Design brief:
The protein is an all-alpha fold. 38% of the residues lie in helices and 0% in strands. The protein has helices spanning 5-12, 30-36. Belongs to the 2-oxoacid dehydrogenase family.
Length: 39
């Protein structure tokens, strides 16, 4: 549904293979990618 995170993800230019999606099952979630940045 309008994945705006695809923007932030490509914005800061990181590798999804460097974070641990805590969505249980490896389901990435916006709550973590932000906990990292969010500053």
């Amino acid at each position: 549904l309008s994945p705006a995170i695809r923007r932030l993800l490509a914005e800061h230019n990181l590798d999804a293979s460097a974070i641990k999606g805590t969505g249980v099952g490896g389901r990435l979630t916006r709550e973590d990618v932000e906990k990292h940045l969010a500053k």
